[PDB]
Amino acid sequence: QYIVARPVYSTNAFEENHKKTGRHHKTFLDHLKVCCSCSPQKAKRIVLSLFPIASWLPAYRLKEWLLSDIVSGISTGIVAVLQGLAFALLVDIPPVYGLYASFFPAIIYLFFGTSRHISVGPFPILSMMVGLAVSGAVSKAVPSLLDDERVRVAAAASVTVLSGIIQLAFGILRIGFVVIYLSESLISGFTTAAAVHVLVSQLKFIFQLTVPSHTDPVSIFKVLYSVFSQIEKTNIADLVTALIVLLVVSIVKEINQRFKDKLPVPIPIEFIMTVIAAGVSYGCDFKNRFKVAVVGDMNPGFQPPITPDVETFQNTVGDCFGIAMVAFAVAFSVASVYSLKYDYPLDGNQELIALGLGNIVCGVFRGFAGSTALSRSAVQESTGGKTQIAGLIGAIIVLIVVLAIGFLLAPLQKSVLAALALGNLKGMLMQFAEIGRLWRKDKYDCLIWIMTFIFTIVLGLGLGLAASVAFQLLTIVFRTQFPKCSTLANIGRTNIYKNKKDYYDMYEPEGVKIFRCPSPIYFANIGFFRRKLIDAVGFSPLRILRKRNKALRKIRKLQKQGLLQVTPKGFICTVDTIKDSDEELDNNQIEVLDQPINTTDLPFHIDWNDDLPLNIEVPKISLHSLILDFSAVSFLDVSSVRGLKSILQEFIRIKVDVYIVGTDDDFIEKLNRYEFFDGEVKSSIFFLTIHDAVLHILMKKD
């Protein structure tokens, strides 16, 4: 049974009886000393962290990893070639830049990356964010089809170079923990909005229509209007072939997911349908019989590096910041699943550095933004990916496609790629069945999800992330704005104290009120806390103090006039009744009422609760003690400290004690720094538990 027999402590007798260890908190001088303390072991650790390949490559097991890595690399290389060709169209650049952006960051990540399963390249969200950034940049540059494509390519290279520089700077600064400011609900809402954006954007390629590059403020609706204002000019053959490809891919993906145990090395539907479509377009000549747009004959080989444009750097700072943040968050979210699945450590700063270097190299070599895509990562993992050697094999396949087999993929329909991209939208769009779950569960994360979706949809991907982050930060204040403050009472004559309106046989101590605030008190909570405390107490301590001071001043004036003769016990009051001549105070003297009462000159100790001569109101209070249950109060910063000090001073000045209960050692240590304690609000008002506070009150009363 719960049996305890201990003395009553007040967080000061406790410390006096039990000696503390006197731990030395770390200062700032020694923080820099240990950082600059260079040692060979720490240097080797830093070098190995910066070059994870030097650690994971010599530990390769070339007996059970080589074949699986090779197969997974071939599969992911085919998928990466197809996905780069598809996503190069979203930026509205020649397709070969998609291959470049699928090749270069993977090669850089093979050296500088810490994850072992993700595949680096383009994914639709980042691709369209880069495209929007390019459209914004080329619309602000100070003043043919070939020239427009070249300027778009240059703008994309500059934007992705700046994004890689930002990512590398973030990784160097060791601030790679910024991924925790994005809630799971915010991630879900943003991903669903981006999925809708992808579905809207791929329509102009499915229908084979010319759509101008729109601007960030309202992009999806403008694109939809532009697409549906020319719906008559659609290509029926292109539309039907896109539908067939999408239907076949979705059906095969469904059967592949359903039949997993019986199906090793899952069917490469992307490759199979792509080669089928290319063979159908060839021979049958799906470029003159119909007017289907096809992927042009890409130049076999790479391209010389270019210097990024400082004008674009200046123009698209915010867009590049958003691109870097989105890429890092997506990469971390994708890599964390496989890291937890296969039990290896993940380094956020190393991931940021690798992504930044890869993006920088890709932009220097005329590419665009690169990260890991969920579809490609899942393909690589399911095929049997064990290390980044699969990524190297995929890069080799991409290089082979770029160099040798370049005449192929030319009869490609330039919209089978769009249908393949839309085939990856099923998992993204299935997240729409989350509003109901969040509404049933939280009712606040549902608000976060809805607001994030609306903000992204009506503001573009670049600004929706910032707006959603701001609203998600505000939702914490929403949570801790109106805490369910309640009065506590004893249950069963034990040390159990719960809500006053919950149980039946409870009992409160005579003239004792226990108040609990089940939320941290900060700038947005001090006023509500004070109002709730005053309402629970039942009177205003400031009002009581002011009325008592007015009564004392009237009594002193009467004594000066001689109507009141002071005696050791009682007042003579040699007047039956006065005409009740009240006195008013001017504007600059009303402060004196708030001053504490000191009746040392009067030998009689005024009770302020029984009766006053000459019929003075002086409202009485039956509350002779107050206990604050600061057990759930995590922190106070400035305004809460000032409000608490004012409330405690007002309470103490009317001859009632205040006790703070439930705070640990750290809370009182922090409060000591705020100059909270003084000659009035001593440090002995803190008690361990409500029962100790109540027992101390009872002991001091009788």
Next chain:
Amino acid sequence: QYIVARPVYSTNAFEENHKKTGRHHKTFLDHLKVCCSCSPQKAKRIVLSLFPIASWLPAYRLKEWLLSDIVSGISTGIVAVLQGLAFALLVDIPPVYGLYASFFPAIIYLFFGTSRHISVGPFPILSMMVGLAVSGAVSKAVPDLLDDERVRVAAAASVTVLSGIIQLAFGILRIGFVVIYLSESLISGFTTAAAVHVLVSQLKFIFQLTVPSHTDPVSIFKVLYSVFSQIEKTNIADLVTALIVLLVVSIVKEINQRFKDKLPVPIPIEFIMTVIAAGVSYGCDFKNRFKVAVVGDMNPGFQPPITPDVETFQNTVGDCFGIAMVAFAVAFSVASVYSLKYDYPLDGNQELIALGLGNIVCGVFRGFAGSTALSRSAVQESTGGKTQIAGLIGAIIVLIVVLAIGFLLAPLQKSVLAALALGNLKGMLMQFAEIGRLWRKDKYDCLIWIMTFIFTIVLGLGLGLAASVAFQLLTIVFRTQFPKCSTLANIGRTNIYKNKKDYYDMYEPEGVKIFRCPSPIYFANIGFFRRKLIDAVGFSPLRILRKRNKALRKIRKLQKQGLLQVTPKGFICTVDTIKDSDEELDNNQIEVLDQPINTTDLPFHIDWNDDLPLNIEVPKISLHSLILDFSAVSFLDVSSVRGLKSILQEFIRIKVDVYIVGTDDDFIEKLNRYEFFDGEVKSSIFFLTIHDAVLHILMKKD
């Protein structure tokens, strides 16, 4: 002493023994029913709240309030005329609009306002924010010195009409509680930055220099450069007269503040120095002897109303929102001091409605934004202001100045007003002695103050408020990002549990770890909480489960091969030593390790902690129970719930119990909605206090 003898409770036996009251929580259907339930008493209350004059005017005491109100009204009318003339120059409009904006909102507030001491009009922060909004609006108008000010006046009228409409909408929506999202540190920083802005902006009038209206991004530095690039063209007479006026005003204000008891009806230094300067300028002709700019001959009378410009409405939406928010916050902050001083209720929604209506009327009648100024409010309160009759008398004085005495104030130097405005900068600039105090106290509110100052200075008043609000919201996440998680232990063989690294004679139960998170756990805290819990425990439950599952699979394979014969007690193990032929698991099958172990088919109960045959590692764990001290955990939303569920499942699946301790009834009630409880994580794992949890563990063990 502290003597307790009660049975051990687990928040379920407690509820079974003590019957709850079964309170009926209010739903949403009845929330609308009580709002639409119209009653005569509620209608009368609503009408009286909407028209507070009908409540406070009949209760007038015309024996002790009339004379003081008249004197305070005369003084505040003189001060309001001077301050309106001064602040009309900051917007760069003819001075008479300052008188209009000092007259109209005061008249509207006399009817629709709830405060009794504040004086409505212009104040420099709002005046310059309106000026910046006007400069932005006139710089974006589509193209079609006397005509240059007309468009500025029209833009100011439109901007203030929109701001008043926004304020009225906010008051109608009953969202007048938005003043609690601005911390005291944020308010102090913004006020100091605005003071610096005022000091910089008034330089062009002190030196009598022509400065173009700059734009929001970097305004103060551009104005400073423009002023100091033409410092040679300054007027020495204007500078010296401004210096004398400022010095005399500051000295007289200092002596007035110091000598308060001996000095009733504080000296009207503004009025006396203004009339002295006007008489000197008129007598000595300070318009041709020197080149001092003077206030022009304002047209005696009012001006017809104008329709606000929809183009300006569309152009300056954000600026109008900022103006409305700043005006409401300033008015509430100024009025709260006097409301607390004189003990009368304040209505935020009524204040918002009154301010919105006043601003709407003033903008319609060609004025600019109106609120209460601290200087004017202090003058009115000190002079003897009791009700808004002082405001009415001030409006009457302003009307008299507008109509009858208009030929005066013409020889005014147009910079003595600037020096008078500078004289009010002492109180604002005294707030610079707060960085040190906040650094010594909080180290977070100091960051808020510094960031607010920097953001406002380098982004303008309109955008600095939003940036500082965002950073202040982020500071809460900064506070609750890395909580000081610690292990707890018993002290003195009682029910007191504190930090493990704090005391000497502590003792932990055998194989029991107590973990405490002294902060609410949300999206930005779940990962850190999991990492700290794993580090405190000393092992990874997922790793232990995976290794145990691998060992079980190897044992089952050996049993199938016949090397292991299952017996009721022990394994025969008819092999001296095997060649240690480990088996690797490919992808799409590694998840089976995470599945829970169910050794029902084996009669032997595997201990998983003593030893295993054929030398299998199976790392042992000494921990056999875990207690989470969720006493300071205020709330979980989605991600924290999911992470807690995953951690608890991982712990339970390795045959260890988890106990959550310290949560109240509301926390478990909220957690029940998240579908947290299921067949594995039951609802009986919640306990009242750490001592109950420990006693239950000891009872279960033996």
